[PDB]
Each structure stands twice: as structure tokens, then as C-alpha cells.
Amino acid sequence: IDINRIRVEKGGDYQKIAESEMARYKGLETLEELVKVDQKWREDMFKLEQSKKESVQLKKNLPIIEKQALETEEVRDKLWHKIGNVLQPDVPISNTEDDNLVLRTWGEIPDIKVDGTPGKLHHNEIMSRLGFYDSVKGAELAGHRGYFLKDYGVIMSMALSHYAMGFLLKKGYLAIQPPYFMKRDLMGKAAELQDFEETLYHIPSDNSKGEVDSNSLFLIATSEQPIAAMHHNVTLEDKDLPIKYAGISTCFRKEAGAHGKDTWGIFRIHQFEKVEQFCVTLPEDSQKIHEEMISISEEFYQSLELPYRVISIVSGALNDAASKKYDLEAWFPGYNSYRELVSCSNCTDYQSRALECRLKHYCHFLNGTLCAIQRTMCCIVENYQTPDGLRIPKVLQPYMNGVEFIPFK
Numbered sequence: 471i472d473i474n475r476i477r478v479e480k481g482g483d484y485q486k487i488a489e490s491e492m493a494r495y496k497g498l499e500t501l502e503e504l505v506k507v508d509q510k511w512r513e514d515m516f517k518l519e520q521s522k523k524e525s526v527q528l529k530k531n532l533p534i535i536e537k538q539a540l541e542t543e544e545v546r547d548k549l550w551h552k553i554g555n556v557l558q559p560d561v562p563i564s565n566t567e568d569d570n571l572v573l574r575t576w577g578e579i580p581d582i583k584v585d586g587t588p589g590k591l592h593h594n595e596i597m598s599r600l601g602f603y604d605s606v607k608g609a610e611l612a613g614h615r616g617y618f619l620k621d622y623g624v625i626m627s628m629a630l631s632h633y634a635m636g637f638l639l640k641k642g643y644l645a646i647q648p649p650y651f652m653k654r655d656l657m658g659k660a661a662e663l664q665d666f667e668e669t670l671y672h673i674p675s676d677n678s679k680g681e682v683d684s685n686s687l688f689l690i691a692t693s694e695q696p697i698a699a700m701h702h703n704v705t706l707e708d709k710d711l712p713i714k715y716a717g718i719s720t721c722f723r724k725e726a727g728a729h730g731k732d733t734w735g736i737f738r739i740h741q742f743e744k745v746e747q748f749c750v751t752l753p754e755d756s757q758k759i760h761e762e763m764i765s766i767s768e769e770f771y772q773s774l775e776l777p778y779r780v781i782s783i784v785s786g787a788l789n790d791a792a793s794k795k796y797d798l799e800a801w802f803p804g805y806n807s808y809r810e811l812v813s814c815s816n817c818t819d820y821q822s823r824a825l826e827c828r829l830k831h832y833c834h835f836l837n838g839t840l841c842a843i844q845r846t847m848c849c850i851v852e853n854y855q856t857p858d859g860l861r862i863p864k865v866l867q868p869y870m871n872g873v874e875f876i877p878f879k
């Protein structure tokens with residue numbers, strides 16, 4: 471009796487998905503269909519268990535049950551990807567970003583009142599007056615948002631990368647530079663569906679008529695994607711992990727949904743560098759490591775003396791993989807606001823189950839920005855500006871051969 475009535479256990483999982491999907495403001499539409507296909511998959515699986523282990527020529531009904539079950543097994547698995555990860559209980563339940571929960575704030579806001587004068591400028595106005603970047607000729611060669619890095623733009627970019635990578639290595643992180651493009655089947659298991667339409671550049675195979683074949687390549691939007699897919703069909707023991715990765719790479723993003731938004735300077739671009747945190751933990755250690763990864767990012771920007779605030783993103787705005795995401799918004803005197811510099815998410819076993827990173831039980835994947843070089847430079851520039859030039863943060867001065875100040879060209 472209770473054996474068949476164990477459907478309470480299966481119905482209890484559908485309840486947790488329903489509560490999370492409602493908090494994501496997804497309307498529980500894809501969920502109601504997944505419940506029906508799951509039963510029909512259980513109906514087809516029970517028929518496929520017709521072992522026939524003992525003059526019946528039923529050997530023709532066996533291929534009919536196998537292929538028909540796979541036709542519904544792929545339809546059922548295609549829906550389990552559209553369902554978002556179950557949110558954690560302390561996630562703000564709201565559909566607008568104006569309800570993002572501010573957790574803590576560090577640093578006093580500077581006295582710069584951006585008005586277009588040399589004493590208070592926007593990041594693009596300072597960097598263009600310092601010969602940092604070239605967007606006129608960069609857009610001529612690569613289209614909108616294209617740019618060159620020049621002079622101390624390259625020097626500060628290299629200095630900030632060394633200080634960022636060294637920051638994680640001193641905390642026991644493992645340095646890693648991944649491939650900058652991935653194949654279709656691997657990228658599909660690491661990136662959301664919206665990433666393909668909005669973000670990922672597509673390099674199709676020759677003579678494929680531009681279609682997405684199995685040999686299609688996609689440039690990485692972050693080192694999170696190749697480092698996550700790096701654990702494909704990998705089993706790890708409790709003695710092997712936790713693993714902390716210090717990823718560094720260039721990032722390619724189409725920004726197709728950010729049309730017209732932030733097009734001056736190098737705040738939002740198609741190509742940028744980023745030093746990344748990626749951690750593989752036990753399910754028990756996931757929440758403890760998530761708070762560690764965000765405090766490491768807090769510590770990094772405290773040493774840059776950039777005021778910031780750490781907020782928790784609302785439920786209706788999260789990606790499908792995040793069970794909870796923390797954002798570090800640093801102070802930009804130009805925009806007179808806090809602007810996003812670091813995202814730190816606890817994805818639990820969303821991608822690891824897709825990638826079959828077994829421990830059925832799976833590992834928990836977490837990712838977090840440490841420093842997006844190009845955008846952090848925009849924040850450094852707006853805070854360390856003077857009417858006579860740019861000041862260099864003390865932590866970066868050793869990496870720049872000792873320079874303390876840069877005058878306007």
C-alpha cells in the first residue's frame with residue numbers, strides 16, 4: 471500500500487519546484503507539463519521492464535518500447551533544463567531589482583561631484599584625456615563598442631590582473647587559464663538558453679550554412695563556463711574537495727540586450743578580461759563557501775579603497791542556475807550611484823547534474839567575480855581622479871614600476 475503511495479515523496483519534490491518557480495515569477499507553466507511527462511516516462515519505463523526472462527515472439531515489442539521511451543526521455547529531459555534551480559529560503563521574493571536587499575555597506579562616499587569639469591569627470595572622459603583607450607578607431611575595426619587599450623591603460627590592466635591573480639593564489643586558489651571557445655554540446659550544458667541568443671558569439675563550421683551543428687564553437691562569456699564544463703563526467707571524493715579555482719581569461723559577450731546602454735568608454739564592451747573565483751564543494755559546505763567567496767571579493771576592493779555595498783538579488787531576476795546571488799556594487803561618482811562590479815552565485819548541483827559531476831548525489835558549483843579588469847578600471851579612475859590627472863591606488867603602485875600619478879596628456 472505505502473509502496474505505491476510513495477508518490478507523496480515524488481509529489482513533495484514537485485511542491486518545492488512549484489514554490490521556487492512561483493518566486494521566480496515563471497508562472498508554473500513549464501512545471502505542469504513536466505509532471506505529466508514524468509509519469510508517462512514512468513509508464514514507459516515500467517513497460518520496458520518486461521524482462522521476459524522465461525514460444526512467445528515478443529522480441530519485436532522490445533525495440534518498440536526502447537525507442538518510444540527514449541522519445542519521451544529526451545522530451546522529459548528537455549523540460550528539466552527549462553526549470554530553474556530551487557531558490558534558498560533567504561532569497562528576496564520580488565520581481566523588480568529595486569527591491570534588492572542591501573546586506574552591508576563599506577566605505578564613505580567621496581566628495582567628487584561629476585559635472586564635466588576636470589576635477590570631477592566620468593570614467594570615459596578621464597581615460598580619453600589620458601590616452602587610455604581609442605574607441606573611434608576601435609569601432610572602425612570591430613564595430614560598436616570596439617576599442618584599443620593604450621599606454622597606462624595597458625599598464626594598469628596588466629598590474630590589476632597580477633594583483634588580482636596573486637590575491638587568490640595567496641589564499642590557496644588554483645590558477646587556471648581556460649580555452650576561449652567551447653563546443654556546442656559542452657557549452658549547452660554550462661550556459662543558459664538566453665546566453666546563446668543574447669551573449670555568446672557563434673563560430674559555425676565551414677559549409678554548414680551558418681546553422682548550429684555539433685562542431686559549432688562558441689566564445690566564452692566568462693571563465694565560469696569552461697571551468698564548469700571541465701568537470702564533465704568527473705567523480706570526486708570528500709577527500710579531494712573543496713577545490714578553489716583562480717580563473718583568468720578574456721570574455722566575449724554580444725550584449726544584444728544592452729543595446730544603447732553604457733556605450734561610452736570601457737564600462738560595457740564585447741571583449742574584456744576578468745579574474746574569476748570558481749569553487750567545487752560538498753553540498754554541506756556550499757553555503758559556508760559562498761559567504762567566503764563574497765568576503766574575499768569584499769576584501770579585494772577594500773584594498774583598492776573603493777567604497778561599495780553588497781546586495782542580494784531578488785528572486786525574479788536570477789538566472790536559472792543560481793539558488794542565491796550576491797552582487798558587489800561599487801561607488802561610481804560619475805553615475806552618482808553604485809554599479810555592479812562582482813556577481814557571486816551559489817548554483818548548487820544545477821550545472822553539475824547537467825555535466826554529471828558525481829560525488830545519486832552531485833557536487834555544488836559556485837562562481838564569483840574577483841575583478842573585471844576593464845570595468846574596475848572605470849571605478850578606480852572615477853574615485854582616484856584629481857583636476858590635474860589620475861592617482862594610482864597604493865596596492866597597484868608596485869606592479870606599475872612605482873608610478874604614483876599620471877598627468878593629463
Ligand SMILES: Nc1ncnc2c1ncn2[C@@H]1O[C@H](COS(=O)(=O)NC(=O)[C@@H](N)CO)[C@@H](O)[C@H]1O
Pocket residue numbers: 691692693694723725736737738739740742744746747810811812813814837838839840842844845
Ligand atoms: N559587457 C561587459 N563589459 C565589461 N564588463 C562586464 C561586462 N559584462 C560583465 N562585466 C563584468 O563582469 C562581472 C561578472 O559578470 S556576470 O556575468 O555578472 N557574472 C559572471 O560572469 C560570473 N562567472 C561571476 O564572475 C560583472 O559584474 C561586471 O563587472
Ligand SMILES: [Mg+2]
Pocket residue numbers: 797810812813
Ligand atoms: Mg550579475
